Amino acid sequence: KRQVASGRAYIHASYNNTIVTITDPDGNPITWSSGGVIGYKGSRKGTPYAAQLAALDAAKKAMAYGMQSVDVIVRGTGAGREQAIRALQASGLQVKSIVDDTPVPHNGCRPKKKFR
């Protein structure tokens, strides 16, 4: 109901899940999917298969609003971070560019015990 036909796609890939959002050139989202949106429930969500299907569910949802051109943004390291990208190029959506914007602090906040 929007007819954007171009916009951005953010890939938030962690070790426990990979989730995909699709937005318009201004940043406001259109549709989205994840490993849990599709049937997977537990640790199967952070798998490259789940990352692939999650990328393709959001891609077909963006076809409804008429998306053709896509700029890709990637945040985080995790299994299926690359499988989500590869699934996005062959999703029919012509991928315009691919950027890695993973936030790295300047050593400002104390991590949890797990991360030290």
Partner 1 sequence: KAKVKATLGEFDLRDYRNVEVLKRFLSETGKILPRRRTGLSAKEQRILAKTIKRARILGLLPFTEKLVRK
Partner RNA sequence: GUGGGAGAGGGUGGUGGAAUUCCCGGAGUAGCGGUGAAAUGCGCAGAUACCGGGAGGAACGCCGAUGGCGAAGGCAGCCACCUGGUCCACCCGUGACGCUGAGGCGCGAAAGCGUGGGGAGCAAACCGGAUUAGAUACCCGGGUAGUCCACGCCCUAAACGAUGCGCGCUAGGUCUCUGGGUCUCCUGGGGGCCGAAGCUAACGCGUUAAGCGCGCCGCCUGGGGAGUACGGCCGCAAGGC
12 binds, among Mg ion, RNA, partner 1, none (CB under 5 to 8 A by kind): RNA
Asked if 22 and 8 touch (Cβ cutoff 8 Å), the reply is: yes
Please say which residue, 24 or 82, places its beta carbon nearer to partner 1.
Answer: 82
The single residue among 19, 62, 85, 93 that binds RNA, judged by CB under 7 A, is: 19
85 binds partner 1 (CB under 8 A): yes
Total site size for partner 1, rule CB under 8 A: 8
98 binds partner 1 (CB under 8 A): yes
| 90 C-beta neighbours (distance < 10 Å), count | 12
Asked if 50 and 35 touch (Cβ cutoff 8 Å), the reply is: yes
For residue 92, give the nearest of 51, 55, 37 by alpha carbon. Answer: 55
Minimum CB distance to RNA, residue 92 (Å): 20
Rounded distance, CA 26 to CA 48, Å? 29
Structure token pair of residue 68: 């053709």
Site residues, Mg ion (CB under 5 A): 16, 43, 45-46
